[PDB]
Amino acid sequence: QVQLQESGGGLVQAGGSLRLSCAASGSIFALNIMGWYRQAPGKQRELVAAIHSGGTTNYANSVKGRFTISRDNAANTVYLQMNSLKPEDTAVYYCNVKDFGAIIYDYDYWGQGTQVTVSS
Amino acid sequence: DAENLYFQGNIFEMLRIDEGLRLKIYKDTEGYYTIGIGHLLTKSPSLNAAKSELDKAIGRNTNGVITKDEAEKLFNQDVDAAVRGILRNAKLKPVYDSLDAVRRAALINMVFQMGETGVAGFTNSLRMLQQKRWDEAAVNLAKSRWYNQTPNRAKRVITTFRTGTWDAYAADEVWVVGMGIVMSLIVLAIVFGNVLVITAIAKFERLQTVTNYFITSLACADLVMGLAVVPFGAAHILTKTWTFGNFWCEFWTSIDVLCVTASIETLCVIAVDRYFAITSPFKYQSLLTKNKARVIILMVWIVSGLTSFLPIQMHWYRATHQEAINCYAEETCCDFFTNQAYAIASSIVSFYVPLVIMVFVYSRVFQEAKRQLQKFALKEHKALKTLGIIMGTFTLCWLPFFIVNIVHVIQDNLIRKEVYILLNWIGYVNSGFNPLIYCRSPDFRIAFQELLCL
Ligand SMILES: COc1ccc(Sc2ccc(S(=O)(=O)N(C)C(C)C)cc2C(=O)N[C@@H](CC(=O)NCC(=O)O)Cc2ccc(C(C)(C)C)cc2)cc1
Ligand SMILES: Cc1ccccc1CC(C)(C)NC[C@H](O)c1ccc(O)c2c1OCC(=O)N2
Numbered sequence A: 001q002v003q004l005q006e007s008g009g010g011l012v013q014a015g016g017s018l019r020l021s022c023a024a025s026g027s028i029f030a031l032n033i034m035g036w037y038r039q040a041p042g043k044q045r046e047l048v049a050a051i052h053s054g055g056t057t058n059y060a061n062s063v064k065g066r067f068t069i070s071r072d073n074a075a076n077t078v079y080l081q082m083n084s085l086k087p088e089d090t091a092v093y094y095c096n097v098k099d100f101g102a103i104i105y106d107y108d109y110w111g112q113g114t115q116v117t118v119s120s
Numbered sequence B: 001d002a003e004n005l006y007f008q009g010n011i012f013e014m015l016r017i018d019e020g021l022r023l024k025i026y027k028d029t030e031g032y033y034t035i036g037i038g039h040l041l042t043k044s045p046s047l048n049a050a051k052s053e054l055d056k057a058i059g060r061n062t063n064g065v066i067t068k069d070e071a072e073k074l075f076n077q078d079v080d081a082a083v084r085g086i087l088r089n090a091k092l093k094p095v096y097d098s099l100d101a102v103r104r105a106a107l108i109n110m111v112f113q114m115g116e117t118g119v120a121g122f123t124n125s126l127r128m129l130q131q132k133r134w135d136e137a138a139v140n141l142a143k144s145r146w147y148n149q150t151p152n153r154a155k156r157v158i159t160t161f162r163t164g165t166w167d168a169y170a171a172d173e174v175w176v177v178g179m180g181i182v183m184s185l186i187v188l189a190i191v192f193g194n195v196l197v198i199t200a201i202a203k204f205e206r207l208q209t210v211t212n213y214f215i216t217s218l219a220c221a222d223l224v225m226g227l228a229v230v231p232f233g234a235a236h237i238l239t240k241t242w243t244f245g246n247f248w249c250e251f252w253t254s255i256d257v258l259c260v261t262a263s264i265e266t267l268c269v270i271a272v273d274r275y276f277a278i279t280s281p282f283k284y285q286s287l288l289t290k291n292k293a294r295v296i297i298l299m300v301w302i303v304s305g306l307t308s309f310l311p312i313q314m315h316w317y318r319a320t321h322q323e324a325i326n327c328y329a330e331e332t333c334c335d336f337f338t339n340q341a342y343a344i345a346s347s348i349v350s351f352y353v354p355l356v357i358m359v360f361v362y363s364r365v366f367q368e369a370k371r372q373l374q375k376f377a378l379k380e381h382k383a384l385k386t387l388g389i390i391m392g393t394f395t396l397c398w399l400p401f402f403i404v405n406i407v408h409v410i411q412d413n414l415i416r417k418e419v420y421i422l423l424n425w426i427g428y429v430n431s432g433f434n435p436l437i438y439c440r441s442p443d444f445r446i447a448f449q450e451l452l453c454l
Helices: B011-018 B045-060 B069-086 B092-097 B101-119 B123-130 B134-141 B145-151 B151-163 B167-203 B210-239 B247-279 B280-286 B290-313 B322-330 B340-370 B377-410 B415-426 B432-438 B442-449
Strands: A004-007 A011-013 A018-025 A032-039 A048-050 A055-057 A065-070 A076-081 A094-100 A105-109 A117-119 B022-027 B033-036 B039-042
Touching: A004 A094, A018 A094, A032 A065, A032 A076, A048 A076, A048 A094, A048 B280, A055 A065, A055 B280, A105 B011, B011 B069, B011 B101, B011 B151, B011 B167, B022 B045, B022 B322, B033 B045, B033 B069, B039 B045, B039 B069, B039 B123, B039 B145, B069 B092, B069 B101, B069 B442, B092 B101, B092 B123, B101 B123, B101 B145, B101 B151, B123 B134, B134 B151, B145 B151, B151 B167, B167 B210, B167 B415, B167 B432, B167 B442, B210 B247, B210 B290, B210 B415, B247 B280, B247 B290, B247 B340, B247 B377, B247 B432, B340 B377, B377 B415, B377 B432, B415 B432
Parallel strands: A011 A117
Antiparallel strands: A004 A018, A018 A076, A032 A048, A032 A094, A048 A055, A065 A076, A094 A105, B022 B033, B033 B039
């Protein structure tokens, strides 16, 4: 009953910038994490950038200093600011929502999927 | 006769249900000092006078406490004396001879309680029993002072005269049967559920997480509960005796306090763990290496071991009063007696410190939720229901036991033994509920689905 709307999938040259936007629908518990996961070709899904409901974030080591995650003030919308894009950053970025409504276990929601292409 | 079947209808089983085995001097409904099974020590208001009468009857310095062996002999001395009084008294024996064996117990029951001379006072009522006017004597007896002081016992006796059956007493036996199958089902749910939780996390690599490592320690403590603590508790209660010796029951008592302390503290650890992981997911994740979650559980079991084996095996929990000494020196008695220091110290570590931390933790989880970067929606209510089950089930199972435990320390005789045992077994069943609360996750449901072979 919740939705994830992913935006900003792009073809872009190396060093260029992309912005990814996710929007959530329905009802989500206040304590949550919204983040971005990418899966490279023939590689495992990894975390790229995450933000907690309280404003605390997290970035992978490869994307630190280059990618910036922001959150809408009140509309459950998350923005991934990707700068200095490398050809290694070529993957499919999934909107995630980590949900803490059931206290004992975190319950994930997953987005549609968007293609990012960096051209060497 | 070939009747070795349970609840033979006779006077001995009739009076034990009415009076009850109490190995310490106690004051009856009327206020007189009574010991054993309805044995009236004296009509004097001085406990000192009742003790010397007891010491004269027993032949030793009882200090107010007699063994089960001695209590049985007084009862038989009391039963036969009531039988002799009926045969000696000229009003009772003609009534007594004309009564079937089932109604003879009811008359002996009265003479047991009120004495030869007292029961002979029922001039019309005894005369009705000769003439076999059962319902008419039943209405007559219900108007007596005997009925007013003990209405419940009089009903059982008056109904027994009226029907000539054991209907007033046979129903008590279904309780032991229903209790046994209920105690049985409790063991199954605890063993089945906890083995199922342990097996899922160990076999499936998806479930090998930090929070689940805490779940595993919880499941292990609850498992041993269902395997070791609970089965012998059922055997102890149903058979009225301990058959495994003194050492094994202190070792059984040692496991009982061990598992319950480790189980409740692990609930506390899981509670704080989820608070941290929910309110600071990233900092917390930097903290817990595999060595910490290992040393935390180690501390929980070291703390639990210091609360359970160290005082019990070193006899530090031992009470000093006479009734405790006897049960300690009796191979077949393993009633639970502790000094006030251990009861308070163990209760705080086992229950009260985890309770306070748990209650505070989930309060702030619910308090942190409102101060976030964001209208009475469902999941906020739905999430509040979830923690209400978690804390509510933990509270309602154990809070009566450890309140009643502390209340028992402050004032003696206020808690009857049955309530103390009942609430502990209501605490015991929290082990069966813990897999149902903490393993609702999607990955668990999958693991259970394959472990049960679809
Ligand atoms: C479920 O039950 C538990 C599970 C794990 C723990 S651990 C712990 C927990 C919270 C904090 S926090 O300050 O409130 N802050 C970081 C919160 C916002 C997360 C600090 C530590 C920690 O490890 N602090 C380190 C210092 C540190 O590395 N960083 C401090 C900081 O970042 O502020 C000192 C410490 C080491 C080892 C332990 C034992 C062995 C008892 C587990 C306790 C404390 C304890 C209990
Ligand atoms: C042996 C017997 C006889 C009659 C009824 C029950 C039992 C079994 C007993 C009492 C051992 N159950 C122990 C109970 O689960 C328990 C757990 C953790 C504790 O820290 C304490 C505790 O008991 C009181 C205490 O002060 N500390």
